[PDB]
Amino acid sequence: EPREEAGALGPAWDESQLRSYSFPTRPIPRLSQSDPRAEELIENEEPVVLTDTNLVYPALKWDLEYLQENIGNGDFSVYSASTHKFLYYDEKKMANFQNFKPRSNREEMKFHEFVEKLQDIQQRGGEERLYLQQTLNDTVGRKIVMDFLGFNWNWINKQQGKRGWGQLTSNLLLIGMEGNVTPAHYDEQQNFFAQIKGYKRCILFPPDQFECLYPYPVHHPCDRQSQVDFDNPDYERFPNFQNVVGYETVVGPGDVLYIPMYWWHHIESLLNGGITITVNFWYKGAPTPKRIEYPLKAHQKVAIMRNIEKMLGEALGNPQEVGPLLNTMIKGRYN
């Protein structure tokens, strides 16, 4: 339902830049950071898009030229795909599954190399696609440390304090090609997704939709991603995917999205809309209370499930025995 930019510059995007999927969605509310309803949503761990935080104001000038000039000669992680659809592997979990080959590999490189791959691809119709995903640190240049220093630390530190969250664990810079998709997954941390350049579509699903989204086993390298291909969903294997309902929004420069911990997210950079730049802020969640309430919340049951899987992997001495044990435990007994 497209936003009109200030100065009559016409709709920022239209519906033809959105991919189409099998499930319905409702909109994540767009609110002011001074609106108490926004504070309610965050405190109840539900998503909201805050339109006026100024969280990353000084990075609103970033583009590829400014960045290439000012970032430094660091190594930037740069992921790859032959399709629009990216797949992250945990390279430590690779010991596990023999019957396995990378199909979206990390390449290390310097920024200018990326800017030139990027723009070479462009001049050859390439379905060959790249995603830069790299922690900001100290190895970055002077003009970028200054920018970063001007982020709205007052606001975000108040949020960490008020919500009782733990420490800021990381801050990634993400630079996407148009059409790029990061398929549905969930993160264990609380997230502020700070949009800087171009437009990203975010479809979220809550923690109680675990059973419709069929993540990989915990020991699999794609731990926490959905096994369901959103473009060609296999309802024979994943029959509850036909009961999935999402929350969605499109965020552009200046918007911040609160992605609550354990919420599923699918993130797509709009078709024909250019390069997208985003920065994220990840925090450890509050510690669990002493006072346990019953019944537990979906995320807590999700946490227990992960733990059963992790323990069983260690007790059996081999993650390939986890499946057969689980199946033996449940058939003819709990169905």
Q: Using CB under 8 A, list all residues that contact a copy of itself.
A: 210-211, 214-217, 227, 237-238, 240, 292, 294-296, 301, 304-305, 308-309, 312, 315-318, 321-323, 325-335
**Using rule CB under 6 A, residue 191 touches ligand A29:** yes
The full DSSP string for 33-55 is TT-HHHHHHHHTT--EEES---T
List the structure tokens of 85.
């659809």
**Using rule CB under 6 A, residue 193 touches ligand A29:** yes
Which of a copy of itself, Fe ion, ligand A29, none does residue 278 bind to, with CB < 5 to 8 Å depending on kind?
A: ligand A29
For 211-248, letters b (16+ CB in 10 Å) and e give: ebbbbbbbbbbbbbbbbbebeebeeeebeebeebebbb
C-beta closer to ligand A29: residue 35 or 227: 227
The answer on whether 327 is annotated among ligand-binding residues is: no
Which residue of 187, 188, 223, 309 would you call a contact of ligand A29, by CB under 6 A?
187
Q: Are 230 and 8 in contact (CB under 8 A)?
A: no
Site string for Fe ion, 27-56 (x = CB under 5 A): ------------------------------
**Using rule CB under 5 A, residue 188 touches Fe ion:** no
The answer on whether 191 is annotated among ligand-binding residues is: yes
For tokens 């420490």, what's the residue? 167
Select the span of 15-23, 180-188, 218-226, 249-257 touching Fe ion (CB under 5 A). 180-188
Residue nearest to ligand A29 (CB): 182
Residue type, 134: Q
As a whole number of angstroms, the distance between CA 145 and CA 218 comes to 37
Cα 300 to the chain's mean position, in Å? 20
Distances (CA, A) of 293 to 24, 43, 289, 290: 32, 17, 9, 9
* Residues that bind ligand A29 in the complex, under the rule CB under 6 A: 174, 182, 187, 191, 193, 259, 265, 267, 278, 280
Question: Which residues are known binding-site members?
Answer: 131, 138, 167-169, 182, 185, 187-189, 191, 200, 224-225, 265, 280, 286, 307
